[PDB]
């Protein structure tokens, strides 16, 4: 029963489908915005990282996935290296790949 | 009577446009003449009735299994 005149944002339906998203670091990395990539990542997440070790490991896994995704392209690889270095981890797995 | 049926006619027209719209919508899920069939019938319908039908079409455009 849609009593209220609904639209592209019916309040009950809007709750039924409220699915928001933030500009995840993939935006900068995939573009290739290194220093801004790390900095915005920290701005959003470093404080938000209630589990700094766990969150750091997860971000590293994401970084490795992203890097592996783009073997041929040069720019993506360079961005991957820089983001790994700014992360604080090893810089040989991605380079070896 | 006829004046009463005239109101019923727009409803009958609304009834006429009722079946065609869903039939186009019906097959379009599990997967066009039905769509125009309503739309053509919709070209020559009343004011409030046809506005309500258009709202229903918008809903059909903004519906899901729960809304189903």
Closest CA to B13 of B44, B51, B58: B44
Resolution of the experimental model, in Å, one decimal: 4.0
Buried b (16+ CB within 10 A) or exposed e, A40-64: bbeeebeeebeeeeeebeebbeebb
Identify the closest residue of chain B to A16 by CA–CA distance: B66
Q: Is B59 close to A5, i.e. CB distance below 8 A?
A: no
Closest CA to A83 of A53, A62, A54: A62
What does DSSP assign to residue B44?
T
Give, in order, the Cα–Cα distances in Å from B13 to each of A52, A57, B7, B24, B42. 65, 64, 10, 17, 8
User: Which tokens is B44 given?
Assistant: 């020559």
Which among A83, A88, A94, A87 has a CA at the least distance from the CA of A27? A83
Nearest to A16 among B55, B59, B66 (CB): B66
Tokens representing B13 are: 């027209």
Q: How was this structure determined?
A: cryo-EM
* Distant-in-sequence, close-in-space partners of A51: CB < 8 Å, separation ≥ 6: none
């Amino acid at each position: 029963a849609w009593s209220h005149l609904p639209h592209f944002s019916s309040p009950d339906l809007v709750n039924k489908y409220a699915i928001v998203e933030r500009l995840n670091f993939a935006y900068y990395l995939h573009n290739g915005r290194p220093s801004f990539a790390f900095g915005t990542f920290l701005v959003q997440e470093l404080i938000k990282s209630k589990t700094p070790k766990q969150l750091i490991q997860q971000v590293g896994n994401e970084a490795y996935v992203i890097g592996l995704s783009s073997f041929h392209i040069p720019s993506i690889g360079a961005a991957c290296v820089c983001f790994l270095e700014l992360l604080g981890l090893d810089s040989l797995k991605l380079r070896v790949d | 009577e006829h004046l009463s049926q005239c109101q019923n006619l727009t409803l009958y027209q609304g009834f006429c446009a009722m079946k065609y719209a869903i039939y186009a919508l019906c097959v379009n899920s599990h997967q066009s003449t039905y769509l125009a069939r309503c739309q053509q019938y919709l070209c020559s319908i009343p004011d409030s009735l046809c506005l309500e039908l258009l709202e229903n079409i918008f809903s059909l455009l903004l519906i899901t299994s729960a809304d189903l």
